[PDB]
Structures are given as structure tokens and as C-alpha cells.
Design a protein. Sequence first.
Lengths: 48, 48, 281, 48, 48
Amino acid sequence: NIINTITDGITYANRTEFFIRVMVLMMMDRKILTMEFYDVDTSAISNT
Amino acid sequence: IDAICSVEGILLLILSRQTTIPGYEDELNKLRTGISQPKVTERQYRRA
Amino acid sequence: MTLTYWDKEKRMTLKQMIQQVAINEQENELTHYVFTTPLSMPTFGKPMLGYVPLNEVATSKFFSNVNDFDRDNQLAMAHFPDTTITQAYNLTNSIKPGDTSLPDAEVAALKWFWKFFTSINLVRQPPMDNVMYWACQFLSSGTSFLPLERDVEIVFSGFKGSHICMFSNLRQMNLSPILCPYYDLITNFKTTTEIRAYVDAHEELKSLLTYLCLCTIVGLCDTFTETRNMDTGEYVWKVRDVVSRNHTPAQNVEKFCYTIQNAKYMIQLVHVLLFPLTDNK
Amino acid sequence: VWGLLGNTDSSYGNAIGATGTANVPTKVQPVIPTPDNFITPTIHLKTS
Amino acid sequence: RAIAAKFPRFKDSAHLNPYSSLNIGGRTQHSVTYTRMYDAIEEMFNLI
């Protein structure tokens, strides 16, 4: 129910309205990422 | 007023086949393959 | 070496410059304009010190129509002749980690150029029909600078058409250690003849600024159409009658939805880089 | 024609939810009659 | 279809189905009758 369709199934209209919802979400959702950190050694670590 | 204008615009995007955006133009022919123009009319437009 | 023009497939800017066609038409516009000293108009007493980059985020922020965040005087550290440049082309006034600065002539040229770019909406730049005229002049007659006597149309064929990606791999392109020696030639008072010899010879910057004037006209014109040959992934897009039917920037949001002050940036650009080819003041 | 074009509720519209009331759609296809229920009246008429 | 059922009617009989279809290969086209009626109304109102 954003796009009426003459069928009782899982037709394309599902994919379409799914697009619509996530699109209007990403229109909104202004977020800023902030975070703290640990501090570890670097000589006692295998990967560089 | 910017909010209502953006609402009208985004809704204008997924209908009215006769308009694109400067670029992709193909994933639109992936998205709007669910509406099946021209079975769409008012009753549907308002629901959207 | 300039930049691999990307399309999801590499390039060398040379295939992508011999890829197009510039074909002329009727209605001789016997309207030979004249050049002009490019109105440097630099001034303000509030700079931004520190490490200001000068190559890649510089060119992107300035000419890729990215955020129009008032993009102001931050280049004002192009006066004050005692500033310096670090090889990564960071303009500063204090080289921190014992990093080295460039020789003089290089510094002089680079500061000259960005100095010309400092403060747009106080610059009194000339109307755009004339700058379109000069641009098509250059890319049609070559470095000889004969008047047009005709009108010209541009057409591109076969790209996996992404003119937005043209503007993009512009956004990712460096230019300063490409056009430095050129403005260096213009600093120590050489003359039109020898600098034309130079631009003919080196030909690395020739292709570049060909592409650059081309991109600015396709971004600021409005007689533009595009098409996809729906049998393959190949767009042909054309711009028709470039110089007669254009007097203001564009807003058709189908081709490249271009804002204003960055447009006056772009015209200042083509002005100030075609300046040293032409005749006296 | 005026009355029709004005106050018509077509079983087609509300089928795809184009002129339904307070809801849409019903997704049931417009029925057209069955070959039964007419053999007998038709033959009845001819024999008359 | 009738004349093969031994129903009665003259030879080379025809009719005027006043309307067209919608499903030509599965496309659901633009329902020509609407274009007809629409330009009719538009022309007439230009005249009034």
C-alpha cells in the first residue's frame, strides 16, 4: 500500500515501494559520527 | 514551504515517465518498472 | 600522466580529446571581439592562514560545482609576497617539519595565478558571450587566434556516456605542476611568439587546457542534447550553435544543474588561462 | 452522459483501486459472464 | 466466430466495436478513446 496493484502476490510493486521507503529515509537521516578511541601498542602487533 | 516543495518533487520523480535526472537514467528504468504507467490516476496519486 | 580519464575504463586524455568533433555551420558571426586584461581585483584584510592546499582539493573545491560554501578569500594568501609553497603544493607561511619550499620562479607564477582567482563577486568580469567567443576561437583555429568567421557545433560519440563523470574525473585531476612552467614563462616577460612556440612544443598542457575550455563551455551552455544509442552502452551528445544562442548560465536540470558564483569562477578561469596567448593590453 | 461521467462507480476502477471509497484496491478481476446461464435462454428463444 | 456456429446472419457481415483494446503484447497502452474524447473536450472549450 503505496502502489496499488491488481494481483495477490509478491510482485515487483514490493521492490518498488521498498525503494521508495529507503529513499525517503535517506532523504532524512542527517547524522554525524562521533567516537572516542583506545590507544594500543604497535610493535606488539602482527599486522602493519 | 521548502518541505512541501520537496515532497511534491520526490513524488514527481517516481511517476511521470517524461522526466529524468542528469546522469543514471537507467536505475530509474529499474525503479519505476513497478508503477505500470498509465494505469495510475488521481485516487492513486493522493494515496502516494 | 595528466589523468586517466575514467569511465569504468581507463584513458589517457588523448583518446578522449581525439574522441570528439568540432564541426562548423552557416551564419558567419562577423563579430570579432577583443580580449581584456583580466581584472585581478584582489583585496581583503581578513585571510585564512595555515596550510592551504593548492592542487587537488583546491581545483575540485573551486571548479567542480561542489558545495557553494561561500568559497571566499581563503586564497587571499596570494598577496604578501613572502609566503611559501611546499612541494605537495601546500601554500603556507610557516614550513613546519623541516619540509622544503620550492624555488622562486615557481612560487612567483603560482601566486600570480591564484591571486588572479582571489575574490570573484567583487571582480568585474566581462559578459559571457565574449568568453564563449574566445574559447571556441582557441579550440577551433588553434594557437594562431584568427577570428572565427563562422559558427561551430560540438559533438561527442561513444563514452558509456557519463558527462557527469567527465566533470568528476575533472574533480580528481591535478594541474599545478602542469601549468607552472607556462605562467613562469609569462612572469619573466617573454613574448607571445616564444610562448606560442612553447605551447605548441610541450603539448601536455595543450591537451589539458583544450579539455578544460571544452568542459566549461559544455557546462555553461544551454543548446545541449544527449542520446543513448540503445544497442550498446554509448551516448552521443551534442551542443549546437555554441556562441550565438547563449547569454547566461544554465538551469535546465537535465544536463548539469549549475549554480552561479561557481559559474563566474569558471569564466574567470578560462579568461585568465587564455590571457597569455593573445596580443597586447 | 452527464450523470454517468459524474456519479459513476465503475467496477473496474475500484478493482485496481482507482475509484474506490476509503480503501483501495480489491484486486479481484472484473467478471464477465460464463458460457453457462445463456445456452438455455438462447435455445429457449430460438425454439420460441 | 458466430458464422462458424451456424448461427444466422448474412454473408460478409461485420460490426462496429466502438472501442479499442488495452493489451497489445502486454503493454497496456494509452487507451486511444481517452485521447479522442480529451481532444474533443479541449477543442470545444477553446471554441466556447
